[PDB]
Structure formats: C-alpha cells, structure tokens
Write an enzyme that holds these catalytic residues in place. Structure first.
Site, short mmCIF file in Angstrom:
data_model
loop_
_atom_site.label_atom_id
_atom_site.label_comp_id
_atom_site.label_asym_id
_atom_site.label_seq_id
_atom_site.Cartn_x
_atom_site.Cartn_y
_atom_site.Cartn_z
N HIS A 1 19.12 -30.61 11.53
CA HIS A 1 19.56 -29.34 12.08
C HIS A 1 20.55 -29.59 13.21
CE1 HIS A 1 16.72 -26.69 9.95
NE2 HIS A 1 15.78 -27.59 10.18
N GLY A 2 21.42 -28.61 13.44
CA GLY A 2 22.33 -28.75 14.56
C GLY A 2 22.91 -27.43 14.99
N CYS B 1 24.44 -28.11 11.02
CA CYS B 1 25.18 -26.90 11.34
C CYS B 1 25.95 -27.08 12.65
CB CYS B 1 24.26 -25.70 11.45
SG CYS B 1 23.63 -25.17 9.85
N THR C 1 12.87 -25.53 10.25
CA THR C 1 12.40 -25.70 8.89
C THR C 1 12.52 -27.16 8.44
OG1 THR C 1 14.58 -25.26 7.98
CG2 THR C 1 13.08 -23.38 8.26
N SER C 2 11.68 -27.51 7.47
CA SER C 2 11.82 -28.77 6.76
C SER C 2 13.11 -28.77 5.94
CB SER C 2 10.62 -28.99 5.84
OG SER C 2 10.72 -30.20 5.11
#
Lengths: 4, 101, 146
Positions: free
Chosen positions: C93-94, C135, C34-35
C-alpha cells in the site's frame, strides 16, 4: 481488480 | 564555466531511477489473480527486451502495455472502467543496458 | 587504444548486484489496510525475471516499517565494490511519497536516502533502481477513447  | 573541477563532484541525487507503477496522485491497480498491471507488464517487457533495448526504452514499452491492455472491471461505478499510466522518473546520467560486452 | 565513448553505465562488474524485493501482503489489523491479494504472483515473477538478469535476488515478506528501514540501512552498508547496480522493488500500500510497512508508513525518501552518492560510496556512479508498485493517492484515470 483492486487498488493499492 | 567557472569550475572545471565541477566534474570532481556529482549530485547526491544522481544515478537514481524510480519506476513508479502510476502517475503522481493516482491509485495503482492490482489484480488478485494475475498480479499488478505494472509488475506483470514490467516483467514481460524485461523478459522480452533486456537483451535488446536500453532500460528507458523497456520502461516506455511497459508504459504502453499498461496504458493499452488494461482497464478495470468493477461492480462499483466509481471504480469501473478505469485506466493507468506508469511514471518513469530518471535521474540517471548514462544509458543502462542489462547486457554487456 | 582507439576512440572511446562513455555513454553507458559499466555493467560488467563481477556481479550485477542485489535485487531486494519487499513483498507486503498482510498488514497489522490495527492499520486497517487490506490484504494485497495477488502480490505473491508479482513477487515470484520479479524473482524469476531478475534471476535471469543475473541479480542476487532477496525476497522479503511482510516487513514492518522498522524492518524496512533496518533492511535498507543494512543493505546500503554492504560491500558493493564488485556490483554493477542496485535494485529495490517495493510492493505495498502507499500514498504520494509513502510506502506502507505492515504496521505503518515509511517515507520513500527515508528508504532511498540510504543510497545517496555521499552515503553509499560503493554505489556512487552506479545505477540505483527503485521499482514501486503502490498507490500514489486516490485519483482514478477515466481514460479517453482512441
């Protein structure tokens, strides 16, 4: 509120 | 001690600090309007305390701010009313102050 | 001179150092990610905050995994002899141990290894700070009343  | 020349080397992993937004294994929360809980709090505490406190003490204030002031709101019960704690990981060997002299 | 103590990093080099902010908002559609709405607020806040700490801030947006690795390599090979410290902020993100480029993941260890004491000699003995908004998995903290 959103998650990464 | 059997090697006084031990001080001639330092570990290659020494002098790193990893300021993680969240505990190992956990999601990290980002608000679409206000920014992420962690970065919001980190910037606020640096602005307030970088001329006053050592960095680990600043990051501890960030931990408290994130832990106490934020809680998720979601229409999805799975994601609602959740909390976050950041995670300071220090391999530093000295105190870090952003000011000098 | 008088008695000396060595308990704090030398932070009075001519420069505080670089602050590299990697702000990944938009991801390639094929990744399914996601953005990251709101991340520009973070990137701007960090830029101002570290500007006022006298860091040389560089903001980079929407880097692929290849661009992230090349940026870290290039930055680690700059002359840091006049710099007190190094700061890198990753917004993406992660998962545990991983941050996402716009087209796929990067091991955090790959990023930070460029700055190892033996691979980045102008930063040996100097603080290397990695600030990671991402994350680390999918667990949720239900909290406890106080």
């Amino acid at each position: 509120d959103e998650v990464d | 001690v059997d090697d006084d020349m031990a001080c001639h080397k330092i570990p290659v992993e020494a002098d790193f600090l990893y300021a993680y937004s969240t505990a190992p294994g956990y999601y990290s929360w980002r608000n679409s309007k206000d920014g992420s809980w962690f970065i919001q709090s980190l910037c606020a505490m640096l602005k307030q305390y970088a001329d006053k406190l050592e960095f680990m003490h600043i990051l501890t204030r960030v931990n408290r701010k994130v832990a106490t002031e934020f809680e998720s709101f979601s229409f999805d019960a799975t994601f609602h009313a959740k909390k976050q704690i950041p995670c300071i990981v220090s391999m530093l060997t000295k105190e870090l102050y952003f000011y000098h002299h | 001179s008088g008695i000396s103590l060595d308990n704090s990093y030398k932070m009075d080099y001519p420069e505080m150092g670089l602050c590299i902010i990697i702000n990944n908002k938009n991801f390639h559609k094929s990744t399914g990610m996601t953005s990251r709405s709101g991340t520009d607020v973070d990137a701007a806040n960090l830029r101002e905050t570290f500007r006022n700490l006298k860091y040389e801030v560089r903001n980079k947006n929407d880097l692929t995994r290849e661009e992230i690795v090349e940026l870290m390599r290039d930055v680690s090979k700059e002359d840091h002899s006049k710099r007190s410290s190094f700061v890198c902020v990753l917004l993406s993100h992660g998962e545990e141990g991983i941050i996402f480029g716009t087209n796929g993941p990067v091991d955090l260890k790959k990023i930070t290894n460029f700055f190892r004491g033996d691979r980045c000699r102008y930063l040996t003995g100097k603080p290397k700070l990695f600030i990671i908004q991402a994350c680390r998995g999918t667990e949720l903290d239900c909290g406890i009343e106080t």
